[PDB]
Design a protein around this ligand. Structure first.
Ligand SMILES: CCCCCCCCCO[C@@H]1O[C@H](CO)[C@@H](O)[C@H](O)[C@H]1O
Ligand SMILES: CCCCCCCCCO[C@@H]1O[C@H](CO)[C@@H](O)[C@H](O)[C@H]1O
Ligand SMILES: CCCCCCCCCO[C@@H]1O[C@H](CO)[C@@H](O)[C@H](O)[C@H]1O
Ligand SMILES: CCCCCCCCCO[C@@H]1O[C@H](CO)[C@@H](O)[C@H](O)[C@H]1O
Ligand SMILES: CCCCCCCCCO[C@@H]1O[C@H](CO)[C@@H](O)[C@H](O)[C@H]1O
Ligand SMILES: CCCCCCCCCO[C@@H]1O[C@H](CO)[C@@H](O)[C@H](O)[C@H]1O
Ligand SMILES: CCCCCCCCCO[C@@H]1O[C@H](CO)[C@@H](O)[C@H](O)[C@H]1O
Ligand SMILES: CCCCCCCCCO[C@@H]1O[C@H](CO)[C@@H](O)[C@H](O)[C@H]1O
Ligand SMILES: CCCCCCCCCO[C@@H]1O[C@H](CO)[C@@H](O)[C@H](O)[C@H]1O
Ligand SMILES: CCCCCCCCCO[C@@H]1O[C@H](CO)[C@@H](O)[C@H](O)[C@H]1O
Ligand SMILES: CCCCCCCCCO[C@@H]1O[C@H](CO)[C@@H](O)[C@H](O)[C@H]1O
Ligand SMILES: CCCCCCCCCO[C@@H]1O[C@H](CO)[C@@H](O)[C@H](O)[C@H]1O
Lengths: 249, 249, 249, 249
């Protein structure tokens, strides 16, 4: 349907999806750069990053944001999730598209507002996702794939709809999945599992080194997610030709 | 209405809001100062603050307190939240006012009971909020603004009332928002996102250096919250003139 | 009532309350002593205790145990909680009594099973609660009082019964209250807020130095809890003489 | 019943139970090895493992996985849990069996996919469970027994079915039980409380030193679990001969 305020609701989503991504990145990357703050106009040694601190920053950002606007847009805030839904035929490409853009832009916008907030920092990488020393790049992409997979998979089961056994908070569970991802990937690849988030940093930093692994890995994981839930473990009893109909509306 | 025990309930709130703030500050700042405790009448080096420990101390204090008296007063415990509700026209100024005072006083009272509990500590700052070395003050206030924003925004969506899709604990979600805030702001500004909490420490310590950023930043974030939820993402279909009516009762 | 299996249910509680305390202490103190394990028949320096690790160990033990047997006995596992209920006239002294004993014994039993598990440790204090260097003993008891207070208060509101606005898990909330307590008191007094738990260690270690503060402090906090919830913030509209009736059955 | 798609559902479980174990181990052991990553073709000192990071990695993996496929197979992902259910006569041996195999294999498969992901690591133990220096082996098995016990016990109470007082998320609670286990056992035995998980590492590493303690300990704890819940604290009013019937179907 493309009439009356069916226009409104839609744009409100895209917009909520756009504003929410700003808070997400600002808060999360904002938390990650916080350890570089022993600063006092000097330059002697440095502090050790806290992986729990960062993983919770990202995960709780999502739990909170999903709780704050999840009813308005579905609180995707991540192309790997959106793409996950799309292939599940639960969303329209018009949506996927407009959303993934609101996402990358919000990231780009947020990652760029931090540059000013934390300008006073040296080799300010702005939390750019980079293959860590010792991680066999490429084959080191099994990390992003599994990290995004488990996430998208959680999102599909949590919004399955045929279920009546869910208990507790959908947001919190999805958020903990997001923290679970970083508890796994922070060390290896700095954890991306979210194309728009990786993208936002690599642009405001013009560093796109291997940046491709942060799209192919999640988008793949999403693919494995939709394949495993929708066809192996929890299949719909309807035919493909009809699911596809969702592609338009 | 201003009759019968409509007086009682009201004062019970203010009071619960006042007592709850005491536990809040005592527990939280109480946790933050705990790392300074390697003490043994000596003075050699010192321990490194734990940001997860502190962020959870604050967040769980709220989750717990919101659970303990949230039904009695709404468990605001924070002018930025109260102010957030007020502008949303969900509360009366008589309330906002009496509450924000119960808040600052509880802080002031709590921050002052700790002085005795932890008197045996050196440069006892009593967890006073201070711009960290390297944070471009002022423009370093985007931290408090975002930190309080995301919080107040969560509180507005969580108590939206038109919703029937909330699942899990409202308290816990709000509490995690409060921990999310510190996971972001502890390093930069010591995290305030709560005027009364900052205020309580700066008074029992007579240090009001830049203390203004801890009111303008949250109160602003609250403003951005109410603007984004009430007018951009989740608008009420009623007119302003009628919402305003709430200003009195 | 004291007929039929009203005997059974009762004893099943006491017993569940007794068995659950064993797991509690074993797991929690078990976690706390774990950092002393760099051991290799040598004796060079030592590791720094993790306060989040310990606070979660205790809190999640409770969340889990309250979830596992909370329907059977109410999952008190703590004289300060039991005593809290008793004064609230929600339990019978026959219960309070039989329970507090199942508690101290379980502690005593558990604290004593660890002695063997961790015998290979040096100055094995078995997690005994001790006033930390720098904490003005006595006036340093405001810690246990606030720590137990906030806890018991959460338990009273969470089982209030007149409420229909609770959402999420009662166990988890109470558990997080228990973790909140340690995030506050670990540094100062090693955190007790639970007479039976302190007691269990001080007996298998014959160290009762100031051990009194771990009964007077919590039991007091409980008192402040029942006073604040039952008479100031959430009063019952019934008279005292009738509540007292509960003292017997 | 062994007709129609009663075959399908069954295999879908086994399979979901098999795929879910892969993500579990990959993510969790994946997180545990992450601290060994300061690597830069050098070899100077090393980082200190984070026990909260690891405990949450395991626990949230379960919370997430139980949420993702718990409706399909029950999300056991652990012989000690399965075995726990079996003895409770809530599952068929045909199930227990096919499941425990899907488990060990998934572990074996996962533990083997990491070998490649983290090949670039030195004495890559692949998170193999080993008795820590100072832990009186054997009598040091009280750890695995208690760790698995508390877990299985939580799973039995959480799926009790006669209950109508559960609140919140069953998955999250079980997940926190899994994190609780590691907060206790990581230091002592590297925490197993899950035969298939220990097994998976010891095979891809051909190190089976004491590996027996990781079966006898959990399987025992499970036994103590089913004994305590099903016969001491929460008994069914039916006779044994009829429960046994479940052994077949
Ligand atoms: C339904 C059948 C499911 C089978 C699942 C087993 C998949 C095994 C593939 O492992 C992959 O090996 C690559 C190197 O060859 C790595 O680069 C990659 O990161 C890793 O993931
Ligand atoms: C509707 C939002 C559209 C956002 C478009 C972003 C395009 C990419 C350029 O980003 C810019 O990067 C600069 C630093 O390099 C910042 O100083 C500047 O402020 C920021 O804008
Ligand atoms: C189905 C959705 C597909 C989305 C594809 C968008 C990928 C993002 C593009 O990254 C680009 O990579 C180039 C190197 O390859 C860089 O030179 C360029 O500056 C950078 O912007
Ligand atoms: C509906 C439109 C929403 C647009 C949101 C983008 C806002 C960009 C403003 O960034 C602000 O820049 C200041 C310096 O100029 C910083 O001091 C301040 O902390 C930072 O927040
Ligand atoms: C109904 C509660 C009213 C509280 C009013 C507080 C006013 C500010 C003064 O605080 C005082 O600071 C002293 C340390 O400087 C403490 O020694 C003293 O105990 C504390 O009271
Ligand atoms: C709409 C709500 C407005 C609340 C305004 C209260 C602000 C708190 C006042 O702080 C004051 O700042 C001064 C410096 O400017 C200090 O000299 C003074 O000692 C300190 O108390
Ligand atoms: C309804 C009125 C509530 C008033 C609450 C304020 C209580 C102030 C008491 O502080 C107490 O001061 C003692 C030293 O004098 C400390 O030893 C003790 O630990 C500390 O808690
Ligand atoms: C029904 C349970 C009753 C428990 C009574 C406990 C009384 C206190 C003595 O504890 C004992 O301490 C010894 C170490 O000092 C341990 O070696 C011994 O095993 C343990 O029993
Ligand atoms: C209303 C409930 C009251 C419970 C009271 C029980 C308190 C526990 C007793 O501790 C005792 O303290 C003595 C020193 O004072 C020690 O010498 C003795 O060995 C030790 O066992
Ligand atoms: C219903 C009655 C329940 C009684 C529970 C008390 C059990 C005491 C057994 O302790 C066990 O002692 C062994 C050494 O002898 C240790 O190797 C083992 O790890 C430890 O667990
Ligand atoms: C249906 C899944 C069946 C899995 C059977 C696993 C048998 C045990 C052998 O594991 C193998 O270990 C090698 C390293 O030693 C890996 O290089 C190889 O890839 C992996 O397969
Ligand atoms: C009721 C379920 C019983 C499951 C029993 C399976 C136990 C796993 C076998 O471990 C084996 O231990 C041997 C040493 O004893 C090793 O030599 C051998 O390589 C290793 O594979």
């Amino acid at each position: 349907m493309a009439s009356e305020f069916k226009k409104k609701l839609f744009w409100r989503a895209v917009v909520a999806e756009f504003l929410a991504m700003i808070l997400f990145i600002f808060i999360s990357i904002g938390s990650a750069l916080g350890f570089h703050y022993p600063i006092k106009s000097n330059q002697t040694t440095g502090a050790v990053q806290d992986n729990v601190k960062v993983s919770l920053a990202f995960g709780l950002s999502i739990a909170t944001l999903a709780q704050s606007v999840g009813h308005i847009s579905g609180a995707h805030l991540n192309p790997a999730v959106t793409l996950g839904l799309l292939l599940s035929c639960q969303i329209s490409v018009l949506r996927a598209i407009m959303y993934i853009i609101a996402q990358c832009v919000g990231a780009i916008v947020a990652t760029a507002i931090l540059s000013g907030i934390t300008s006073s920092l040296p080799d300010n990488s702005l939390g750019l996702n980079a293959l860590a020393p010792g991680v066999n790049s490429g084959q080191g992409l099994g990390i992003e794939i599994i990290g995004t997979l488990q996430l998208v998979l959680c999102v599909l089961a949590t919004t399955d709809r045929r279920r009546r056994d869910l208990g507790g908070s959908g947001p919190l569970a999805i958020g903990f999945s997001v923290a679970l991802g970083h508890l796994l990937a922070i060390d290896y690849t700095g954890c991306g599992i979210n194309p728009a988030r990786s993208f936002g940093s690599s642009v405001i930093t013009h560093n796109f080194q291997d940046h491709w692994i942060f799209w192919v890995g999640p988008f793949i994981g999403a693919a494995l997610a939709v394949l495993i839930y929708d066809f192996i473990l929890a299949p719909r009893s309807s035919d493909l030709t009809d699911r596809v109909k969702v592609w338009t509306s």
